[PDB]
Design an enzyme around this catalytic site. Sequence first.
Site, PDB file in Angstrom:
ATOM      1  N   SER A   1     -60.276  21.512 -26.157  1.00 48.75           N
ATOM      2  CA  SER A   1     -61.540  22.237 -26.162  1.00 48.75           C
ATOM      3  C   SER A   1     -61.510  23.692 -25.716  1.00 48.75           C
ATOM      4  CB  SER A   1     -62.586  21.470 -25.353  1.00 48.75           C
ATOM      5  OG  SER A   1     -62.980  20.301 -26.046  1.00 48.75           O
TER       6      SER A   1
ATOM      7  N   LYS B   1     -62.481  26.205 -28.196  1.00 50.40           N
ATOM      8  CA  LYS B   1     -63.863  26.611 -28.416  1.00 50.40           C
ATOM      9  C   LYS B   1     -64.161  28.035 -27.964  1.00 50.40           C
ATOM     10  CE  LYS B   1     -65.167  21.816 -28.181  1.00 50.40           C
ATOM     11  NZ  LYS B   1     -65.394  20.707 -27.240  1.00 50.40           N
TER      12      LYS B   1
ATOM     13  N   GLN C   1     -68.243  13.143 -30.648  1.00 52.05           N
ATOM     14  CA  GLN C   1     -67.266  13.113 -31.728  1.00 52.05           C
ATOM     15  C   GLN C   1     -67.898  12.567 -32.999  1.00 52.05           C
ATOM     16  OE1 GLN C   1     -64.597  14.568 -31.034  1.00 52.05           O
ATOM     17  NE2 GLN C   1     -63.472  13.761 -29.265  1.00 52.05           N
TER      18      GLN C   1
ATOM     19  N   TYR D   1     -72.809  17.978 -25.165  1.00 46.78           N
ATOM     20  CA  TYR D   1     -71.502  18.478 -25.563  1.00 46.78           C
ATOM     21  C   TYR D   1     -71.075  17.767 -26.846  1.00 46.78           C
ATOM     22  CZ  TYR D   1     -66.475  18.263 -25.901  1.00 46.78           C
ATOM     23  OH  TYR D   1     -65.201  18.222 -26.421  1.00 46.78           O
TER      24      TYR D   1
ATOM     25  N   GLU E   1     -68.212  28.868 -20.231  1.00 46.57           N
ATOM     26  CA  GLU E   1     -69.212  28.292 -19.340  1.00 46.57           C
ATOM     27  C   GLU E   1     -69.038  29.105 -18.061  1.00 46.57           C
ATOM     28  OE1 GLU E   1     -68.504  24.013 -19.288  1.00 46.57           O
ATOM     29  OE2 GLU E   1     -68.544  24.037 -21.485  1.00 46.57           O
TER      30      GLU E   1
ATOM     31  N   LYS F   1     -63.212  27.164 -18.792  1.00 45.22           N
ATOM     32  CA  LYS F   1     -63.261  26.206 -19.881  1.00 45.22           C
ATOM     33  C   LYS F   1     -62.124  25.211 -19.735  1.00 45.22           C
ATOM     34  CE  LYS F   1     -65.061  24.287 -23.414  1.00 45.22           C
ATOM     35  NZ  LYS F   1     -64.626  23.020 -22.748  1.00 45.22           N
TER      36      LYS F   1
ATOM     37  N   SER G   1     -58.584  19.288 -23.435  1.00 47.09           N
ATOM     38  CA  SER G   1     -57.592  18.219 -23.429  1.00 47.09           C
ATOM     39  C   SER G   1     -57.394  17.602 -24.806  1.00 47.09           C
ATOM     40  CB  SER G   1     -58.023  17.081 -22.494  1.00 47.09           C
ATOM     41  OG  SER G   1     -58.497  17.544 -21.245  1.00 47.09           O
TER      42      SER G   1
END
Length: 350
Positions: free
Chosen positions: A59, A62, A115, A145, A266, A303, A306
């Site tokens: 992630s 992102k 997902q 999320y 974030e 951020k 994984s």
Amino acid sequence: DPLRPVVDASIQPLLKEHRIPGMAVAVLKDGKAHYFNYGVANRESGAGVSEQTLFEIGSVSKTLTATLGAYAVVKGAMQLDDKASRHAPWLKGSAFDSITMGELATYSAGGLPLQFPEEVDSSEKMRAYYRQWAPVYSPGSHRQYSNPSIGLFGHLAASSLKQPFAPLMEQTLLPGLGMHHTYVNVPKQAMASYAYGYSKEDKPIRVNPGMLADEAYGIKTSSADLLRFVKANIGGVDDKALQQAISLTHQGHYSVGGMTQGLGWESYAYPVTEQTLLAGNSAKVILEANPTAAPREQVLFNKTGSTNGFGAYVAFVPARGIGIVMLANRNYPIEARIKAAHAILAQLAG
Ligand SMILES: [Zn+2]
Ligand SMILES: [Zn+2]
Ligand SMILES: [Zn+2]
Ligand SMILES: [Zn+2]
Ligand SMILES: [Zn+2]
Ligand SMILES: [Zn+2]
Ligand SMILES: [Zn+2]
Ligand SMILES: [Zn+2]
């Protein structure tokens, strides 16, 4: 290295506790990069980890995808308030005629899941999925999320720029950020530097194919390249447009507790307590839906990321010129990543 004792003190216990095969750590302080490498990239061969070793960052991808979207905004190819269907003719006549690009980017479109359902494994099935998706919450009211959410944002951002996502990132965006060894698809000449991930059972693995995986969690990079990204987020880049794009990813859109959601990154008011950092990166914020609140009015950006066999974390504070990158080939607890990073950052800050 004067900083080795400090970094070792927080990293070594982590490696032992979670049997992490290898980890590449990079720190930024007073404008200089410092590298601390531990263990192996390949357990079978014993190849050691270096700041050039490629790790899956999940992630954390992102933040790069978000930067591509911001770049598209700066170039005038799209606006965050644009309805999603404005950039995908196949979305016309769906819920996405009333959802914005910004909402997709900040996981606030209205309940898109974490997902894609297991069955959505093709372009045709993915389009059908979005066209049939029913909003769970009003747009902008809740943060859930979601990979399908930011994945679509990135996919459409690339479309707005009239280029496929992968080549757009590898041939234009990443090079512009000074990241020449960061890939969506690792090329032949770089495969030898690509570490293997390790599952809980210690089996060598790498990221599995998935729809919009490139946009949501498919980046492979080194600690050196990711620290260059951190530097770009602090010291800046030469390209004016890209610099403007980077700044856009620092703007807060809304908050959830002490965490403020922006494009990719974030953020938290700095100084930030370990407690606040842990909360913003907790399972409650990551897995469940949470109502959005007004954005935060020094700042730390971070951020987590994984894959089944990798665990990454990046955090930095522009005003203090400090940052840290931790890339491991074991998906170990996020709480452990935050605690180590918070400790090291505190020492770097003074
Ligand atoms: Zn030591
Ligand atoms: Zn050093
Ligand atoms: Zn497409
Ligand atoms: Zn090169
Ligand atoms: Zn590919
Ligand atoms: Zn609610
Ligand atoms: Zn573990
Ligand atoms: Zn002090």
